[PDB]
Amino acid sequence: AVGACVLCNSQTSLRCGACIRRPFLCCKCCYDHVISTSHKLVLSVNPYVCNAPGCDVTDVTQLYLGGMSYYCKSHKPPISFPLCANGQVFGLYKVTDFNAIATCDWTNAGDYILANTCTERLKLFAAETLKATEETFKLSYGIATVREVLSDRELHLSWEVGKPRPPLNRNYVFTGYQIGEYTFEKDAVVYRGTTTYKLNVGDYFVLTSHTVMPLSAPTLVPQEHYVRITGLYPTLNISDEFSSNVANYQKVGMQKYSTLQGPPGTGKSHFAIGLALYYPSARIVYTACSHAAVDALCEKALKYLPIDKCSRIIPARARVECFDKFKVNSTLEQYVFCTVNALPETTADIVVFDEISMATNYDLSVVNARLRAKHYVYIGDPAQLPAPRTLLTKGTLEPEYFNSVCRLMKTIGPDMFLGTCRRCPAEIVDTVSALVYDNKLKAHKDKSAQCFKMFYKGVITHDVSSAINRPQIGVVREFLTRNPAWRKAVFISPYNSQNAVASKILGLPTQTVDSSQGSEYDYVIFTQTTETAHSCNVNRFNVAITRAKVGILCIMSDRDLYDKLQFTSLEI
Ligand SMILES: [Zn+2]
Ligand SMILES: [Zn+2]
Ligand SMILES: [Zn+2]
């Protein structure tokens, strides 16, 4: 009931009862909150409400101090002090941006912009509130009950009328009921039970709300710059394979935190595992938001790091199938591969945070709060995709507002830039280099002359809100007959429903652009599907076409992105 002020850090008992994270505000500022905002409830030991029986006045502006207790203008004694006056609110030890964070609903991009252009404690308040707000919204959705089970991987569902029905995708993980997490992919719909169990008629699923914990630690600890490699011990036998990264590996030592912008296929994974071989005594924790991104740093470790000092930290409530080749849940191994949401309380010589574009400031804080370390390494690309902000429906989130790392990368540059794409045909590298990397990204590979674009708007249908374009799938059918080499291509689109249909018609494996991020395939077929803000997002486009090692076919809906593709145009 006693704490410090989440603007100035002055000691107070004054929380805001109105704010969803009951923040401890100082007297001068708790005033400037309640007189600016609809927020009028103030707490301390006991609530600032009128003590007169049957009186409902809780607005601190309408309240007074009468002896030891509080009352309204209708109930105060003659000797009484107004709680709200002299620019302060009476409390123990006796802003715009703080108001906006407290009061906003997180449906606008300007709410996320502010939550990344503010002070560090506000960012934590913001991140807490947002996640808080995110969670409380999940309740508002309608339960889904199994009517009948068609087969092993399909069924039909009955919804609770009144409350809305959330969109069926691989982006909305339900909790079945306690028969493990499930998901839904396009009556006939698919039921993806992460735990193998015979689906019972009557049983229900719910979007379970993992409660928001408060944030102690900042997003970014303060930066520290040294004269020499503090706390680590470098070799000079570092295999030529990692010789390019030595000046940067030394930068990692002569700094507290370091930021690496690596465009697709420029050797992030390689650099991370290569930091262990250069500081080979060092205990390292490898962390990223997703099981896939951690499972990626595991594969690039199996190859170069001794398998005996590697533990894949699995959360005891196991989500989806994971990395096996390591010892499971050995916290104190030299090498620890763990999702941010499963990080144990520990310390380390180096922490590498990978896929930083996908980090929420929450995620940045949780990592700092579970890991005290000599050197923090933040690896990814603000030109790739951020974490989906499910409440955001109005405006676009620019990369300089993804989190504090991305904001740094976009304003004063990253510390270190991997400037050579080794994965992609030069047609792709040349395209994204101009589109999102101010031409600073260079192609190692030659043009493949296997990169094709076709402008074909086709016909957009919608399965609820997810888009389909059958004509664009029909153009890909025609192309596959004339290009049998592409029979092994991964089909990629910005939409699950399109993928659902292309699966059934083409027979190719299927991937949304967002789930393609971090992966690579010889041959990619991309149907843009629609001409929306979603399907024309330059970061999503960037990711989509930089999945390809050898060839890509882009069926485009957007003239601009179509013209920008430095590919051979096909005809039909
Ligand atoms: Zn408030
Ligand atoms: Zn204050
Ligand atoms: Zn009263």
Curated annotation (Swiss-Prot):
Changing residue 213 to I: In strain: Omicron/BQ.1.1. Zn(2+) 12 binds at residues 16, 19, 33, 39. It is found in: Host endoplasmic reticulum-Golgi intermediate compartment. Zn(2+) 13 binds at residues 50, 55, 72, 75. Residues 237-418 form the (+)RNA virus helicase ATP-binding domain. Interacts with nsp8 to form the replication-transcription complex (RTC): nsp12, nsp7, two subunits of nsp8, and up to two subunits of nsp13. Interacts with host TBK1; this interaction inhibits TBK1 phosphorylation and decreases by 75% IRF3 phosphorylation, which leads to reduced IFN-beta production. This is Helicase nsp13. It comes from Severe acute respiratory syndrome coronavirus 2. The lineage of its organism: Viruses, Riboviria, Orthornavirae, Pisuviricota, Pisoniviricetes. The chain holds residues 5325 to 5916 of 7096 of the full protein.
